[PDB]
């Protein structure tokens, strides 16, 4: 067959990933799914696009849906971009190189937040896997990681390499000592979940699920072993919804600290720290007011503490925007004015500039300098059509109608409309028809660039589907009104000719390429086929478990394929109304299934974001191509069949176009290494007068003892038995050095005693023959220290038991 692949993707400015900003008023780099886009704020269009590679639909592309980049984080000085993907792989990028600088895969979940250190060597990585792994770009490895947090990493702050603060989704904030790799102290950031953190100077502010935002102080040199991060007060903000991101600004000349809090609702609420002598002036004033009120000195002091948070900071402005913001960034700083960039859930980027002087801003409301909507669509595409001439793509969603040229991938014409459900496009590229849920039928002409005629009362209910005859004279409408209505064009306006009653509402309408007959879907799970010339019922198609979502008619017109929410795609023979075969293609509901023109084969798209190619003759999936991260709402095929387009809830539009050591033996080796080492250490010291042990990070005597401890007991006696004498002499040297270290002896005395007795018993004749006078001293010394150790434990045992029974006797006498 002929393989299919995805050539070029568009239609989305960026996904729900953080905004990354570079000055230029500024330029913003925001990513779309796996690819990265750069949008200049002044122009409103992208300067350039950064794409990883591995185009979707290619053989080398992985079957499973690709992971989008959740978090983009940049360092200007190195000119490098860190990309965090859903799977967990972190890819280092350079905007100039246009490729991946470095690939890091150590996180099992998506990366929550990121940070380049100023040096650029270390990149702090935070993931939802509850682990912070500090990644070294120049080292190409993770030097270490932090695991104490029990929930996802909502934020972290590391300006100084020495110390680190991290805040978790659970709500516990834990200061970290990096060199020791342990958390210094733990306090709850909030009773609820903590999602936002920000450190500046001594000041620490955190926001939780509740409205109130908590102010903290941290004294890095306190070293009190307690109260390292402490709260003075909590100030209640207006928005009950939390703040995902907190970023601050100060101007050194101004000496004023402004900041925003990016909330999960559209409004971003902002706050400003008051200037200290003004706070001092306010403190004096409030003391005055209290004296006129008559409060006592103790009362006067009390009110200062409660209002102390109010003394510190005040709101300079609350900025409100048209669309919900996924992320925001502090772009520009100036005492004269502030300018901010924010990326919206509706895929449009808004940028606001506000001037202020002294306490409050001059402008009562924020003003938007620029926007990015030319390439942006506010709502997901419900219905897509391909132009007959094949050089125009018609895109329809709520309150918007977009036409996209194939080569440019840029919107040539934008049309205002209603909640359009289905889109249809007449032959010759003159007109397009849109059907709204409100009941109105909207007709536009590309040359007019405006609506010709609207019939609000065409259908009282929603026009859930629409189709045209091959001649195009008759327009077939299927609506929730339970009646199929036929509209005939006249010269241009539409007039109603005939209506067909039906028992249920119409889900879809499909007119055959030959125009002989019309197929109708209904809610009762049944498909019906009517003769178009006579409007007489011809045959039904029964047995579907759930309603059919789409109906398509093959070019030969002998077979139709019904796609239904039951997740089974069924092909039906019209000549006699039989189902030739049924396939469970997708794990979720199948929206649309389209015959390839002049081919029995068909594409299919479903809620679970899987789009598949199926052969009519083989009746099996030709190719499984997975590109979207969300439900693929609709699919349209070119007249030639060269290219096919799909739309997903992500707002992205994709164009698809065809191209061994034995027990005891290890003890022998371990003994040689350590005894070689201890002989050296003694050898080196007398003169003054290996790699494995370093990795073990234990003493040469300690390393062997782990080996001895490692040996299983049942094989231990045989291990000693096979052991030659020359190594037994080494093993006696081992004990003496172990015996020198008193701490290790008592920890493992019982095991050492049994081994020594077995060896001496098993080599008593060999031992006695040896004439080494030094060997006397080794056996003598081990004896004296062994006796003290054994006697000590015995004396403690006999001491305890004797008094232990004494207690029993005394209790008996009392109760007896």
């Amino acid at each position: 067959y002929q393989r299919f692949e995805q050539a070029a993707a568009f239609g989305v400015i960026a996904s729900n990933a953080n905004c990354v900003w570079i000055p230029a008023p500024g330029q913003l780099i925001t990513s779309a799914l796996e690819d990265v886009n750069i949008w200049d704020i002044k122009t409103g269009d992208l300067v350039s696009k950064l794409s990883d590679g591995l185009p979707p639909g290619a053989s080398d592309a992985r079957g499973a849906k690709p992971a989008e980049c959740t978090y983009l984080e940049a360092h200007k000085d190195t000119d490098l971009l860190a990309v965090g993907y859903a799977d967990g792989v972190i890819k280092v990028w350079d905007l100039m190189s246009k490729t991946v600088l470095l690939n890091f895969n150590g996180h099992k979940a998506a990366i929550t937040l990121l940070q380049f250190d100023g040096t650029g060597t270390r990149l702090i990585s935070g993931s939802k896997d509850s682990n912070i792994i500090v990644w070294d770009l120049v080292g190409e490895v993770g030097l270490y990681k932090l695991r104490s947090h029990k929930d996802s990493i909502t934020g972290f702050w590391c300006q100084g390499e020495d110390w680190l603060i991290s805040t978790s989704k659970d709500g516990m904030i834990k200061l970290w000592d990096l060199k020791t790799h342990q958390c210094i102290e733990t306090h709850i950031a909030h009773t609820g979940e903590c999602w936002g953190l920000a450190v500046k100077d001594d000041l620490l502010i955190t926001t939780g699920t509740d409205s109130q935002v908590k102010i903290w102080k941290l004294d890095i040199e306190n070293d009190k072993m307690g109260g390292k991060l402490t709260e003075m007060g909590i100030f209640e903000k207006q928005s009950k919804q939390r703040g995902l991101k907190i970023e601050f600004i100060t101007n050194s000349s101004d000496k004023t600290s402004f900041f925003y809090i990016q909330n999960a609702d559209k409004t971003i609420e902002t706050f400003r720290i008051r200037k200290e002598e003004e706070i001092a002036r306010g403190l004096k004033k409030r003391e005055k007011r209290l004296k006129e009120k008559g409060l006592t000195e103790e009362e006067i002091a009390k009110s200062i503490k409660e209002s102390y948070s109010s003394f510190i900071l005040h709101p300079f402005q609350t900025i409100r925007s048209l669309y919900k913001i996924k992320s925001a960034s502090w772009t520009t700083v100036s005492s004269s004015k502030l300018e901010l960039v924010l990326t919206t859930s509706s895929n449009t980027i808004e940028y606001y500039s506000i001037p202020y002087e002294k306490r409050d801003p001059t402008s009562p409301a924020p003003l938007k300098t620029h926007t990015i909507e030319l390439q942006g669509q506010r709502t997901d595409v419900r219905s897509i059509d391909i132009s007959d001439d094949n050089k125009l793509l018609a895109t329809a969603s709520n309150g918007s109608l977009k036409i996209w040229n194939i080569k440019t991938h840029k919107c040539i014409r934008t049309f205002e409309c209603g909640y359009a459900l289905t889109c249809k496009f007449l032959p010759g590229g003159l007109l397009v028809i849109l059907g709204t849920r409100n009941g109105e039928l909207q007709l536009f002409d590309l040359a007019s660039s405006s609506l010709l005629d609207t019939i609000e009362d065409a259908h009282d209910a929603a026009i859930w589907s629409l189709d045209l005859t091959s001649d195009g004279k008759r327009l077939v409408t299927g609506s929730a009104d339970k009646t199929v209505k036929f509209w005939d064009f006249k010269v241009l306006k539409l007039h109603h000719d005939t209506t067909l009653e039906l028992t249920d509402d119409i889900l879809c309408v499909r007119v055959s390429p030959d125009d002989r007959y019309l197929a109708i879907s209904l809610l009762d799970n049944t498909v019906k086929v009517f003769f178009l010339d006579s409007m007489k019922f011809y045959l039904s198609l029964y047995g579907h478990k759930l309603p059919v979502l789409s109906i398509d008619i093959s070019f030969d017109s002998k077979m139709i394929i019904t796609s239904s929410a039951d997740k089974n795609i069924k092909i039906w023979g019209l000549d006699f109304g039989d189902c030739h075969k049924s396939l469970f293609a997708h794990q979720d509901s199948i929206m649309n299934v389209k015959f390839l023109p002049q081919s029995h084969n068909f594409f299919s798209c479903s809620k679970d974001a899987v789009v598949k190619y199926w052969d009519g003759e083989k009746f099996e999936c030709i190719q499984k191509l997975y590109a979207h991260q969300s439900e693929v709402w609709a699919l349209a095929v070119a007249t030639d069949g060269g290219f096919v387009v799909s739309s997903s809830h992500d707002h992205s539009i994709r164009i698809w176009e065809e191209t061994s050591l034995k027990a005891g033996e290890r003890l022998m080796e371990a003994l040689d290494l350590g005894i070689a080492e201890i002989e050296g250490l003694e050898a080196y010291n007398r003169d003054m007068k290996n790699a494995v042990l370093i990795a073990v990070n234990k003493t040469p005597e300690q390393y062997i003892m782990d080996t001895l401890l490692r040996i299983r007991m049942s094989q231990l006696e045989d291990a000693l038995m096979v052991m030659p004498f020359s190594y037994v002499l080494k093993f006696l040297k081992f004990i003496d050095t172990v015996m020198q270290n008193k701490t290790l002896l008592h920890s493992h005395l019982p095991l050492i005693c049994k081994n020594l007795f077995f060896i001496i018993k098993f080599n008593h004749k060999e031992l006695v023959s040896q004439k080494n006078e030094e060997l006397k001293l080794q056996i003598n010394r081990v004896k004296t220290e062994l006796r003290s150790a054994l006697k000590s434990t015995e004396d403690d045992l006999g001491f305890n038991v004797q008094g232990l029974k004494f207690v029993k006797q005394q209790w008996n006498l009392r109760h007896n």
Binding site: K150, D505, L507, L523, P547, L549, M591
Partner: protein, 85 residues
């Protein structure tokens, strides 16, 4: 005296003589101990006809309330906006 189960619900005490309070265990050790328990428990004429009823597929059981259910005890077997949206 013989070591038994933990008296406190929040602790695990093995026969080894070691007690394990749940709070101090790290997540990884919590997982294996759960798996360790799993292996321990894993190894640890009317009936003859009832399996025949469950063996057969073409048997429908009617309860007192009148509903039809299979032998296993499970019931043997729309909004326009939801289906299309």
């Amino acid at each position: 005296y013989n070591v038994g189960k933990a008296e406190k619900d929040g602790e695990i005490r093995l026969k080894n003589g070691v007690a394990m309070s749940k709070e101090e265990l790290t997540r990884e050790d919590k997982n294996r101990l759960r798996r360790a328990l799993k292996r321990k428990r894993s190894k640890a004429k009317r009936n003859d006809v009832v399996d025949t009823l469950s063996k057969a597929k073409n048997i429908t059981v009617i309860n007192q309330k009148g509903e039809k259910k299979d032998v296993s005890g499970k019931t043997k077997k729309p909004d326009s906006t939801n289906i299309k949206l």
